[PDB]
Amino acid sequence: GLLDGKRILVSGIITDSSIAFHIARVAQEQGAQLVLTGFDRLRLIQRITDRLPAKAPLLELDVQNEEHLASLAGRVTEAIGAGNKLDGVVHAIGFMPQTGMGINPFFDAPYADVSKGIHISAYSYASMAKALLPIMNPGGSIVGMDFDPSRAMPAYNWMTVAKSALESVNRFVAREAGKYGVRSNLVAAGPIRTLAMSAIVGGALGEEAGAQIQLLEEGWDQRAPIGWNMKDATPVAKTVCALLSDWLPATTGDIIYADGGAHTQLL
Amino acid sequence: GLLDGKRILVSGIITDSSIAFHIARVAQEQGAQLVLTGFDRLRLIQRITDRLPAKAPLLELDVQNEEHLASLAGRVTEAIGAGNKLDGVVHAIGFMPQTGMGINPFFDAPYADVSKGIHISAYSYASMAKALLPIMNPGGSIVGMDFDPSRAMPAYNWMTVAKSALESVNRFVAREAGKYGVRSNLVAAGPIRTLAMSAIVGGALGEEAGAQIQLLEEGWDQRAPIGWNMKDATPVAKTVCALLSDWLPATTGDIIYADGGAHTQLL
Amino acid sequence: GLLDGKRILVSGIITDSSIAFHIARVAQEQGAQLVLTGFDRLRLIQRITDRLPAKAPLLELDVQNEEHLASLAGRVTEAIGAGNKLDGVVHAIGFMPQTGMGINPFFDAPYADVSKGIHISAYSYASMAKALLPIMNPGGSIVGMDFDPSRAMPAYNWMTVAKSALESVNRFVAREAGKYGVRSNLVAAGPIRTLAMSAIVGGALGEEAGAQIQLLEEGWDQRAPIGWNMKDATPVAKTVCALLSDWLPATTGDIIYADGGAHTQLL
Amino acid sequence: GLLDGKRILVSGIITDSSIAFHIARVAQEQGAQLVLTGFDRLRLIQRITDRLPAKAPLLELDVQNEEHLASLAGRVTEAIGAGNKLDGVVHAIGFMPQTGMGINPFFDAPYADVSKGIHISAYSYASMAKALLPIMNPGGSIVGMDFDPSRAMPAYNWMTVAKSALESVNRFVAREAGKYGVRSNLVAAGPIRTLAMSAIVGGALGEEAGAQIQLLEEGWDQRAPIGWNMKDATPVAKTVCALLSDWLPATTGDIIYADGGAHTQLL
Ligand SMILES: NC(=O)C1=CN([C@@H]2O[C@H](COP(=O)(O)OP(=O)(O)OC[C@H]3O[C@@H](n4cnc5c(N)ncnc54)[C@H](O)[C@@H]3O)[C@@H](O)[C@H]2O)C=CC1
Ligand SMILES: NC(=O)C1=CN([C@@H]2O[C@H](COP(=O)(O)OP(=O)(O)OC[C@H]3O[C@@H](n4cnc5c(N)ncnc54)[C@H](O)[C@@H]3O)[C@@H](O)[C@H]2O)C=CC1
Ligand SMILES: NC(=O)C1=CN([C@@H]2O[C@H](COP(=O)(O)OP(=O)(O)OC[C@H]3O[C@@H](n4cnc5c(N)ncnc54)[C@H](O)[C@@H]3O)[C@@H](O)[C@H]2O)C=CC1
Ligand SMILES: NC(=O)C1=CN([C@@H]2O[C@H](COP(=O)(O)OP(=O)(O)OC[C@H]3O[C@@H](n4cnc5c(N)ncnc54)[C@H](O)[C@@H]3O)[C@@H](O)[C@H]2O)C=CC1
């Protein structure tokens, strides 16, 4: 397996359609031993992760909670056994209050809402790296999930701003992670039909936002030289596993696009 | 003059070495009629702006204060006279608490501090545009100040992250500003020896940060095909005035680099 | 006028719909004294340029002709008078054989054809700078015309490759031009309905290429926050004049987008 | 092995320090069956490749020779056996005449020399893809070698321009390769001490060019968060193998940086 013998922490599972669920599945298919972290609904997350190929300990982590972060490394060391360190960390965490996304006008998101979204979606990449680098092995790899924010787009609004901040944060965590012989990169994925995204396309954040996002999805597949299947997270999971492996050993502070090549084409 | 008859709001003057001071001077030399906004120390700012080529009303604006923003357009309309609108807006506002810049390790900036810095340095570009677009003329121009955040750098730390967020915000304000026939752009300047920057080079945020920043400055001039003079803000002021003019009428959501060309060269 | 007293060479006029025709017109409206260069059909070009606001000497320049280039500076000095130097140079030259554009498959352009297109469209920017820098004043400006090649697009095929080469060439000419106190930049324009482009949309290079290009044009206006009018070259002419002026004095090796902001937006 | 059962063509071996030699070695260590192509000095190349972990047929390919290209697919099919197709193609070909690199002034490279360099270094990526896609399997991968040309640099001169053209070509070959279910990407490597590069650092193209390149190398390692070892090609070989594998299945028209992260950092 691509990740035989590696110990990898995977955050961000909430449903069986989470990108992180597929990352976790693929990583286990490839020989990795996982520790999972979950937010708020631990009983649900446990029930979901029971469906993974192998059992994995689940630890609670609210990235906005200082105590959770302070205790994190000790709790992971307990789960993987003293004397063992992590080889990989997956940040698959993102949130923006609905005032910051969709039909709510861009100028009407109050800063308390965007700040919460930036905390969870961007700053937390640094928080997690701070927590976990002390328990990571040389040759290790930290990976986060990105959605290409280099051009503005309808509806995504402040979440795009949050992703712009995340990409900047990633370049700084690579500097810190380098002192540990650890890489830090993001995977920029094409749009994926997670539960939240399905609800949004169905109009959860207003009809016009739903319509624009559906339009956005169609253009993506059309632009992608090898196509893009929003219903299939596995090509993105495989990409994260590539970065977790020893096979991109000279890539750090960087962004790998798992998007069908859509960002390389105009029409 | 390049800006004859234009009415332009200029934020961000705090000392006679502020980039915004030079923007204001150059704009007045070019025939613009100004309204100034200042933060906190209004008596000082008045004394500084007395030195400008022409008199200009000074209005208080703390970009973190909802009431200041709510009243802003009415106060500007009063200063410029009912029935007149603004043609230009200059955002020259930036701040990051010292935990987010310098020798303080990147991972040790508490989120309350980075959030304050992002509020002032990035979100406020949207706040000001929201406040002022209702009183801007078609063909108008909003300009903000950027420091190229596309690669990480020593010391600047979370301020670089804030600038990454600002660039993303700018692309979204261009969408909103377009409905008014208004452009929105940033000028990415090379490093300038403002009071704060002089103190930082002199070690205000720790010796090693001062040393790295001085090194950064030297490399800039060395890379710039036409050189770079950190002691002279006027080429950056002139660039802002270019964007405020009618001479870049098809540029919006964009970034103009006033940096001697340094960002286009590797060594 | 924006360019009062400046002496500026303008290449690339072939019809009254050439972008360079509008550059020349606007520059003369702004007080510039022009020298024109034309390719092959000098009698036609003279008849076209007779319609400019002021008379201007026309010099023959085939950018593929070593002798034309060797004699160029002497011929310009003769036209503007000994002891006078140029302040500005406009490169508005581009060509790709039809095997390199349109419905002809990308893989079927023979290298002799792409090499001719790269010679005329990219290398010649360096040729002209080599010829003219010896007769340019400090504070001068060289400007070339770009079409954003950062993503691939239907039909434009090898011309896009040529533009990618041009952008790289520009960064190197900025290094050389800097020794003379001269700036070098490109204006990346949105699509403009020149004669050649009209013929192409009408199917001169095959129906499907025409269709894709028309689609490309529509998306541009739709993406542009301030819109995009392919029938109007003046906003691009104005942008070139901005770079020819003293108002972007710290920008070199760079690209200014006169495209309605379309490149900053995804949808 | 990462590439078990894959059939892969590897061009560009000339010495045992060629990047392509290490690509070939690593690919064979990972279970790939290779076909090699070599230019001009076939007897030498055979002697060098005898040192690879496994035997591999060597086919002559001068990328400037139309007949070599016309016969290429038939010769490969013969070497791998009728009914078998390629899964991978590695383009590791680059050349620029010495008038286009080093101390020879940028403006003094005659176009015949740069055209030869662009033919070999950029156009040939399209030539090879044209030749080989008809004999590639769905899920296959074409990879070329890039040196980041987004900023100008001393000495590399027209080779940087050639790399800018290559990156553009890659995005177009991805469009064509997509019709075959094939990906096309480049690996942008940090500087590597190949024979040619060692000679250049030692002054083969003039002292000042040698000095600037040595300076360039040192800055790279200094900028790279995980460091950069110019004497070790294996991290770049591993990266090429990652792209040849099934583990980046949604990446095409793209660039992966195997450069220690140096391009993500300013200082
Ligand atoms: N779905 C898509 O189209 C794309 C998603 N991404 C990114 O992939 C990552 C995973 O998201 P998806 O799988 O799409 O959605 P999801 O809703 O399945 O996953 C989001 C995760 O964020 C976690 N989270 C929220 N607040 C948290 C907190 N305070 N502490 C800890 N965890 C918290 C949630 O519990 C959830 O598990 C996110 O960064 C998302 O932005 C990137 C590109 C596309
Ligand atoms: N100095 C440099 O090397 C460069 C500076 N810039 C940017 O130029 C802009 C102007 O900064 P400088 O002239 O360098 O420094 P400065 O210290 O002269 O100006 C900063 C301004 O931000 C204002 N400000 C801070 N908090 C505020 C608040 N809550 N409400 C309203 N205003 C507030 C301050 O009053 C001050 O006038 C900033 O965005 C800065 O990031 C960009 C590139 C380089
Ligand atoms: N029309 C459009 O949609 C856009 C055009 N551009 C660029 O603007 C520049 C001007 O082109 P347009 O005005 O569109 O077309 P045009 O056909 O009016 O101008 C092209 C010029 O290139 C000149 N030329 C060709 N071969 C030459 C040679 N060997 N020596 C000297 N001159 C030669 C032609 O004589 C002609 O004057 C070109 O670089 C073009 O690529 C950039 C963006 C968009
Ligand atoms: N060495 C370095 O610092 C870096 C090299 N690269 C690229 O890696 C690739 C491989 O180069 P290196 O291993 O460095 O040098 P090398 O000299 O070992 O390999 C160059 C190959 O190009 C081949 N070639 C030249 N003309 C040819 C032709 N007409 N037909 C077929 N093949 C021809 C040569 O035979 C040689 O095998 C090139 O694209 C180079 O630009 C990219 C980044 C850095």
Numbering used by the authors:
A (entry chain A), B (entry chain A), C (entry chain A), D (entry chain A): 3 to 269
Lines quoted from the article behind this entry:
To further investigate the mode of binding of pyridomycin to InhA at the atomic level, we crystallized and solved the structures of wild-type InhA and InhA (S94A) mutant in complex with NADH as previously published. To further corroborate that the D148G mutation in inhA was indeed responsible for pyridomycin resistance, we overexpressed this allele in H37Rv and compared its effect with that of a well-characterized mutation associated with isoniazid resistance, InhA (S94A). Initial experiments determined the NADH-binding constant (Km) and confirmed that for InhA (S94A) it was around 6.5 times higher than for wild-type InhA. Enzyme inhibition studies showed that pyridomycin was able to inhibit both wild-type InhA and InhA (S94A) at a similar Ki (6.5 and 4.55 µM, respectively). Additionally, these biochemical and enzymological results confirm that InhA (D148G) is more resistant to pyridomycin while InhA (S94A) is as susceptible as the wild-type enzyme. The pyridomycin resistant strain PYR7, that carries the D148G mutation in InhA, is not cross-resistant to isoniazid and ethionamide while, conversely, the S94A variant that displays isoniazid resistance remains susceptible to pyridomycin. This suggests that, while both pharmacophores are competitive inhibitors of NADH-binding, they bind to the pocket in different ways. Data were indexed, integrated and scaled with XDS. Both wild-type InhA and its mutants crystallized in the P6222 space group with unit cell dimensions of approximately a = b = 98 Å, c = 139 Å, α = β = 90° and γ = 120°, with one molecule per asymmetric unit.
InhA (also known as FabI) is an essential component of the type II fatty acid synthase system (FasII) involved in fatty acid elongation and is required for mycolate production in M. tuberculosis. The FasII system is highly conserved in bacteria but absent from humans making it an attractive drug target. InhA is already the target of the current frontline anti-tuberculosis agent isoniazid. The combined results unambiguously indicate that pyridomycin is a competitive inhibitor of the NADH-binding site of InhA, NADH-dependent enoyl-[Acyl-Carrier-Protein] reductase, the target of the two anti-tuberculosis pro-drugs isoniazid and ethionamide.
